[PDB]
């Protein structure tokens, strides 16, 4: 069936069909374009007219231009031939390596797995990152979220996780660049070639790449996450092996929806967002999951506009996660990296019956001492340290050492820290904080604990700091 463009306003294109009107979600092909331009049907406006969202720029479009109904939603290449390749929203190769040598395809719109398909298995996934492992550990096959305002360390952390978890992974990984920097896409692509996780000459590639960065119009940015996760769903269901799915940044899916919302004729909801924010997110998030058929460990970077965690976008995201790592500018500003808020990061498996009583007790002990110090800071800033009881100033000095021992040099952050990266075993993480809490290092200077790996390095640093 054939339609004609009747209106163009930014990324939103209205198309009239004299006969066979395409259903919502269908992919339409604009004729007379040099490069393929897909419109996705969003609404039926009435009068044989559909309202659509463009997957590429709308410059050059003319009222009267012919549009073909493909008879299906956007369909993309899936399967092992996506590994080591880079794809865009509509499935095209963007790596100058010729066609995606596949002939299995999948619609980017799909129903979420049902309640009966859910798995309740939850076992710890050790990261080698002290703050994460101690306080809010990740679970294999679980949903992990990395919250943060602009420039606090979401991407550095996700890259460190890819380094610490994915490089020694027994299955396949999918990375979805959603509304982020193209430079970061180039960085990651060449890094994985250098590491061999992508191989341009044999079939040993472990990672499939999907990108629609902040250079793209909102339709692209609204849909690239669906493309990225469709690739993941194939590896989960048709194989049954374990999959890692990394998304940076999932906020950009919601932001793109908000960019076109007024042009789709919607009254705004709170904070300028689309009224559909939560159901939109729900239909997308509920597909990102482990099932009885296969495991997905998902790690999603989540932007926090204006650093406000109550912003509808991040606020609605929390309920979709099993583990939350919340980054804070207030902490990053102090040179504490990773900038994890130890009093705002949580995990379903932070339970004495899962991690054991030792792990749980030390984690809660660390949180208590830090909350006690936080509550004191403001009082002592005005009335002075000398007004504190011996018990209070002991909790102050230990808390400040604990804050520092949570900081850690990342291998992927060597260009920022000037320190060699470190990976700390969970056993050593527990022991280290246990000893600080127990007052075993009360005699050591504060700075000995800053920017090190295991507790033995803090002792060595204290000796070095003497002379």
């Amino acid at each position: 069936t054939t339609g004609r463009i009747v209106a163009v306003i930014g990324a939103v294109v209205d198309v009239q069909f004299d006969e066979g009107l395409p259903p919502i979600l269908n992919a339409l092909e604009v004729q007379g374009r040099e490069t393929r331009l897909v419109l996705e049907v969003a609404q039926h406006l009435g009068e044989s007219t559909v309202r659509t969202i463009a997957m590429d720029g709308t410059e050059g479009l003319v009222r009267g231009q012919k549009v073909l109904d493909s008879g299906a939603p956007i369909r993309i290449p899936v399967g092992p031939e996506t590994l080591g390749r880079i794809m865009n929203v509509i499935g095209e190769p963007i790596d100058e390596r010729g066609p995606i040598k596949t002939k299995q395809f999948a619609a980017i719109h799909a129903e979420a797995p049902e309640f009966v398909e859910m798995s309740v298995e939850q076992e710890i996934l050790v990261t080698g990152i002290k703050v994460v492992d101690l306080l809010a550990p990740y679970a294999k096959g679980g949903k992990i979220g990395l919250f943060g305002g602009a420039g606090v360390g979401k991407t550095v952390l996700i890259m460190e996780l890819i380094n610490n978890v994915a490089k020694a992974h027994g299955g396949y990984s999918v990375f979805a660049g959603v509304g982020e920097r193209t430079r970061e896409g180039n960085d990651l692509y060449h890094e994985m070639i250098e590491s061999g996780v992508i191989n341009l000459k044999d079939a040993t590639s472990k990672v499939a790449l999907v990108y629609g960065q902040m250079n793209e119009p909102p339709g692209a940015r609204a849909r690239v996450a669906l493309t990225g996760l469709t690739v993941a769903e194939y590896f989960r269901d048709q194989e049954g092996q374990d999959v890692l799915l990394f998304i940076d940044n999932i906020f950009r899916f919601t932001q793109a929806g908000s960019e076109v919302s007024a042009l789709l004729g919607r009254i705004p909801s709170a904070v300028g967002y689309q009224p559909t924010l939560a159901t939109d997110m729900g239909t997308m998030q509920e597909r990102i999951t482990t099932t009885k058929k296969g495991s997905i460990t998902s790690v999603q970077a989540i932007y926090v506009p204006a650093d406000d965690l109550t912003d509808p976008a991040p606020a609605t995201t929390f309920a979709h996660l099993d583990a939350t790592t919340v980054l804070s500018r207030a902490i990053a500003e102090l040179g504490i990296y990773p900038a994890v808020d130890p009093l705002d990061s949580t995990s379903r498996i932070m339970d004495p019956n899962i991690v054991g009583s030792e792990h749980y007790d030390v984690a809660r002990g660390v949180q208590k001492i830090l909350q006690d110090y936080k509550s004191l800071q403001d009082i002592i800033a005005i009335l002075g340290m000398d007004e504190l009881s011996e018990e209070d100033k002991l909790t102050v000095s230990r808390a400040r050492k604990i804050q520092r021992f949570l900081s850690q040099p990342f291998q992927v952050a060597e260009v920022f820290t000037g320190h060699l990266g470190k990976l700390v075993p969970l056993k050593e993480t527990i022991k280290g904080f246990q000893q600080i809490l127990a007052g075993e290092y009360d005699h050591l200077p504060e700075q000995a604990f800053y920017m090190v790996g295991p507790i033995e390095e803090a002792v060595a640093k204290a000796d070095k700091l003497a002379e």
Binding site: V6, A7, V8, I9, G10, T58, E59, G60, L61, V62, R63, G64, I94, D95, A150, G151, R181, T182, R183, G185, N186, H190, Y211, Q213, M214, N215, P217, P218, Q255, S258, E259, V260, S261, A262, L263, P268, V271, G272, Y303, P305, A306, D307, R329, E333, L334, G335, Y337, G384, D386, V415, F416, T417, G418, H419, P445, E446, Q447, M451, L465, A466
Partner: protein, 490 residues
């Protein structure tokens, strides 16, 4: 006999820089059209019964019933080395009284940024000549680095010192080390832009600088357009194996001009009345700053966008929007400014997302750990405010931090060569300033720098050529600062 409303149309209404046009059946989205009077406009809204056209000029020149004619294409601008030394408007028209601009090349303003493949990692230093920037938040060629802060915190001055800094390279004959500059003024007053140009001419910097100016009394479409047009001029160098720097002064005013246009096109407002896609406005512009691989010439375009905050709130909507686009930011504060911290850079809140990869080995040697160290120093300074018993290690951390803070203070209009920066930082980072009174550090730096320029050009020239501090240079520096310091203390 005329019935053809395919290539032409008629003004239905005109007001506040928006013409609604009947006809123009064949007009393209974003196509430039021409009114009866000669005025141009862009077709931004294609609606079933009308075209919404934004007017590039004074709407008194448009009336109901006026014809509107198709041009055939989107906006473009003069492009090339003929623009260097010239002040132009948002469309590249000469506004400096020096004569018409005659380039052999033209370029479209609305082109999409290069994708993943044409790119290669930022690795070449873009030297500002500002100690605090080059050492703590280094900028490479192809990077985007935001300059952000309240009114009168020193934002433009960072960009100006940077442009003036390039003369050292541009006077030479090595084309891969040169940096051609573009200053885009958006929403400023003409007299300010004129004083800016006088400054760049007196420093003999205009000769390698294009000034693109859409000022406060220019129509909103011209201010909206100016950054993209300047960007196209810079992309010329980028795509021809050369290196350009572009300053957008400022993007806050561009967002305001775009907000007006959008509200008047009757596109419904979002947060703070800004259009729903105010992020996309800046993200598409800034993505076009890029470093090209050798296949595409190896050229680059570096962007320094400017954002004005209100009451120092870096965490605001539009600021964090732009922070979330760029590869770092330089954050300036009034508090620091008046304390004598000039440039007024907040270290902990400023970042570079390229880091040491954008530094010479020499700078990487002396400044490798300094940023995190200074961030930690400010935390300990705040905590130790009351004179309570402090251990030797914290006292040393405080002593060092106070002295390095003094070292990063710098005047205006004398951007420093990289080897000179390394030499001064060296004296601080190696501990030679630790026993000096904080008040006498600037005195030390002035006397020390002038001495090594006077007597040790062989050492400085070796650091500049090698791009590093060799073991021989390190031994020479060590001998110089030890004996110099012994004299200074008495």
């Amino acid at each position: 006999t005329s019935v053809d409303l395919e290539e032409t149309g008629r003004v239905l209404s005109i007001g506040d820089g928006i013409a609604r046009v009947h006809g123009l059946r064949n007009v393209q989205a974003e196509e430039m059209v021409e009114f009866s009077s000669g005025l141009k406009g862009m077709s931004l809204n294609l609606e079933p019964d009308n075209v919404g056209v934004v007017v590039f000029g004074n709407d008194k020149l448009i009336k109901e019933g006026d014809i509107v004619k198709r041009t055939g294409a989107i906006v473009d601008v003069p492009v090339g080395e003929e623009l260097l030394g010239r002040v132009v408007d948002a469309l590249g028209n000469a506004i400096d009284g020096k004569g018409p601009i005659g380039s052999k090349a033209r370029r479209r303003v609305g082109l999409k940024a290069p994708g993943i493949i044409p790119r290669i990692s930022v690795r070449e230093p873009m030297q500002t000549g500002i100690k605090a920037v080059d050492s703590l938040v280094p900028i490479g060629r192809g990077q985007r680095e935001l300059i952000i802060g309240d009114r009168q915190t020193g934002k433009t001055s960072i960009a100006i010192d940077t442009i003036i800094n390039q003369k050292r390279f541009n006077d030479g004959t090595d084309e891969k080390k040169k940096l051609y500059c573009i200053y885009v003024a958006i929403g400023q007053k003409r007299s300010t832009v004129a004083q800016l140009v006088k400054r760049l001419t007196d420093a003999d910097a205009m000769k390698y600088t294009i000034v693109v100016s859409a000022t406060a009394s220019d129509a909103a479409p011209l201010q909206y357009l100016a950054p993209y047009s300047g960007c196209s001029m810079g992309e010329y160098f980028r795509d021809n194996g050369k290196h350009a720097l572009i300053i957008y002064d400022d993007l806050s005013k561009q967002a305001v001009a775009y907000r007006q246009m959008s509200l008047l096109l009757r596109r419904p407002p979002g947060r703070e009345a800004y259009p729903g896609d105010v992020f996309y406005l800046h993200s598409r512009l800034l993505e076009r700053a890029a470093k090209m691989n050798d296949a595409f010439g190896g050229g680059s375009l570096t962007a320094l966008p400017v954002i004005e905050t209100q009451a120092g709130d870096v965490s605001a909507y539009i600021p964090t929007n732009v922070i979330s686009i760029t590869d770092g930011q330089i954050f300036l504060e009034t508090e620091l400014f008046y304390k004598g911290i000039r440039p007024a850079i907040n270290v902990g809140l400023s970042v570079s997302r390229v880091g040491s990869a954008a530094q010479t080995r020499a700078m990487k040697q002396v400044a490798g750990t300094m940023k995190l160290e200074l961030a930690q120093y400010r935390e300990v300074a705040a905590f130790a405010q009351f004179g309570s018993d402090l251990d030797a290690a914290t006292q040393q951390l405080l002593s060092r931090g106070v002295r390095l803070t003094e070292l990063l203070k710098q005047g205006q209009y004398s951007p420093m060569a990289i080897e000179e920066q390394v030499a001064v930082i060296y004296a601080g980072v190696r501990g030679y300033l630790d026993k000096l009174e904080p008040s006498k550090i600037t005195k030390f730096e002035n006397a020390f720098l002038s001495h090594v320029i006077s007597q040790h050009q062989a050492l400085l020239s070796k650091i500049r050529t090698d791009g590093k501090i060799s073991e021989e240079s390190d031994a020479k520096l060590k001998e110089i600062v030890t004996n110099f310091l012994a004299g200074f203390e008495a």
